[PDB]
Amino acid sequence: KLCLVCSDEASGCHYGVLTCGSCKVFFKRAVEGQHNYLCAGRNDCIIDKIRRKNCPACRYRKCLQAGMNLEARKTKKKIK
Ligand SMILES: [Zn+2]
Ligand SMILES: [Zn+2]
């Protein structure tokens, strides 16, 4: 039911894991601009619906932690 990064209701399977549409596009836009996200804190920001925008670094590390990857979407559009 819930996005694995930010805990809002999931929308589907994107880049291998169950996510909302918002984290789908964050991650898409992150790997396309290869952004230098750094965390001003101690890498322990809460990532939830209200706070996810506060620290793209910490939200980025969560997608990785939850196992998103560009490898999944490439292969899934080739299988199709
Ligand atoms: Zn999310
Ligand atoms: Zn942070």
Residue numbers in the entry: 419 to 498
From the study:
In cells, GCs bind to the glucocorticoid receptor (GR), a steroid hormone nuclear receptor that regulates the expression of thousands of genes. GC binding to the GR ligand binding domain (LBD) in the cytoplasm causes it to translocate to the nucleus where its DNA binding domain (DBD) recognizes and binds to specific GR DNA binding sequences (GBSs) or inverted repeat GBSs (IR-GBSs). In fact, crystal structures of GR DBD bound to various GBSs revealed a loop region in the DBD, the lever arm between the DNA recognition helix and the dimerization loop, whose conformation is sensitive to the bound DNA’s sequence.
The eight molecules contain four dimers that are linked by a disulfide bridge via Cys431. While this dimer appears to be advantageous for crystallization (no reducing agents were present during crystallization) it is not likely to form under physiological conditions in the intracellular reducing environment. Within each dimer, one molecule shows clear density within the C-terminal helix (H3) following the core DBD, whereas this stretch is mostly disordered in the other molecule. In the free state observed here, H3 is rotated by approximately 60 degrees so that it would lie across the minor groove of a bound DNA. The largest differences are located within the lever arm region and are similar in extent to the variations observed in GR DBD bound to different GBSs. In the free crystal structure, His453 is flipped out in all molecules. These observations suggest that the lever arm, including His453, is mobile in the free state and samples multiple conformations resembling the various structures in the presence of different DNA sequences.
